[PDB]
């Protein structure tokens, strides 16, 4: 019954001509619900889940103001950081920002986040206590001193513990039918001979939500990692996720092997065995 | 809902 809200911003400079490309996305758990793309025609924050479309024009006006202003802030910051790092004006660079909050099943604040990167490495991040910053290098130390003087952590903390938690709660009751549902994995095993003496067993998990899942093989009841392969969890494109795990076994010995599936939507883990 | 832009870097 725990939940999260996150925003992800990406700004990429383009020195051949014009302003940086800015993309913002918002998520509740593993469900995207809004986007902004500075190269799109609308120039508005846009809905990406049916349940947010009910929000009124004032909602969209305020969210659009914020992300358009953020795109300008990032533009300025790309310039400032180029200077801090003594980089040329000719190259493209990237700023990334993530922030958001986690709540417990009671809907109360658990944890807040705010972290920033430059060219795919840590730049500055708010600590878990929401009261202090971690600056990765002497460039980020400059930013840290400025942010301390501006009481930026206090401002971030008030949002993370206040508005973030309150709007996450509102969305969870607005999109309840999907956001508060768990879809357990649809599981099955396949069998593929490799040679006269070996075969692959593959354990499939399909259609599950949220994305967190664990697949594990055992042989005669003991965990087995030798001769196994696993794919990264992947989106199906319809709001659900997929994963598989495989093991190579001597042919005839298939019944020794079991696949064990853990997911939030399963009251007890599932066990599968080739018959 | 988003947080407004924070202080420049």
């Amino acid at each position: 019954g725990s939940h999260s809200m996150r925003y992800f911003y990406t700004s990429v400079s383009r020195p051949g001509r014009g302003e940086p490309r800015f993309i913002a996305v918002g998520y509740v758990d593993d469900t995207q619900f809004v986007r902004f793309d500075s190269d799109a025609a609308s120039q508005r924050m846009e809905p990406r889940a049916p349940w947010i479309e009910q929000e009124g024009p004032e909602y969209w006006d305020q969210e659009t103001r914020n992300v358009k202003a953020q795109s300008q802030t990032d533009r300025v910051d790309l310039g400032t950081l180029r200077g801090y790092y003594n980089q040329s004006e000719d190259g493209s660079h990237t700023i990334q920002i993530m922030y958001g909050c986690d709540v417990g099943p009671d809907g109360r604040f658990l944890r807040g986040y705010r972290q920033d990167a430059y060219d795919g490495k840590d730049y500055i991040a708010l600590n878990e206590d929401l009261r202090s910053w971690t600056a990765a290098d002497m460039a980020a130390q400059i930013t840290k001193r400025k942010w301390e003087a501006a009481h930026a952590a206090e401002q971030q903390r008030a949002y993370l513990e206040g508005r973030c938690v309150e709007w996450l709660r509102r969305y969870l009751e607005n999109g309840k039918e999907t956001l508060q549902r768990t879809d357990p994995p649809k599981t099955h095993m396949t069998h593929h001979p490799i040679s006269d003496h070996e075969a692959t067993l593959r354990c499939w998990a399909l259609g599950f939500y949220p994305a967190e899942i664990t697949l594990t093989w055992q042989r005669d009841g003991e965990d087995q990692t030798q001769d196994t392969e696993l794919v990264e969890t992947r989106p199906a494109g319809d709001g659900t996720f997929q994963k598989w795990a495989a093991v190579v076994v001597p042919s005839g010995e298939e019944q020794r092997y079991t696949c064990h599936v853990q997911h939030e939507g399963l009251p007890k883990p599932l066990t599968l065995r080739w018959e | 809902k988003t947080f407004p832009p924070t202080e420049p870097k």
Binding site: F8, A117, E232, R234, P235 | -
Partner: protein, 99 residues
């Protein structure tokens, strides 16, 4: 820093000949975000392809899902073609409906 894409090519639903479905190419773990991704039908680029909005993981690496509606057949072969500043040539990953 720079990071090379990981690539998975797979269908939205269990693949069955003559039954409409979606072909997915999931690209992840890459940096920077500029990337070229095409879906190929018998080696030729498919025109109608959409993708998810750019997002990233904890380690700052990006991920995108590229997708198109298709109807699998016995004869037709599909693949995903990726280019990225980290690759010296485009990387082609064939669709295997067992994977």
């Amino acid at each position: 820093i720079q990071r090379t894409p990981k690539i998975q090519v797979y269908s939205r639903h269990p693949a069955e000949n003559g039954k409409s479905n979606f072909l997915n190419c999931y690209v992840s773990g890459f940096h920077p975000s500029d990337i070229e991704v095409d879906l190929l039908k018998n080696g030729e680029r498919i025109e109608k392809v959409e993708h998810s909005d750019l997002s990233f993981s904890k380690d700052w690496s990006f991920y995108l899902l590229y997708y198109t509606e298709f109807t699998p057949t016995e004869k037709d072969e599909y693949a995903c073609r990726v280019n990225h500043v980290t690759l010296s040539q485009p990387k082609i990953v064939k669709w295997d409906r067992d994977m």
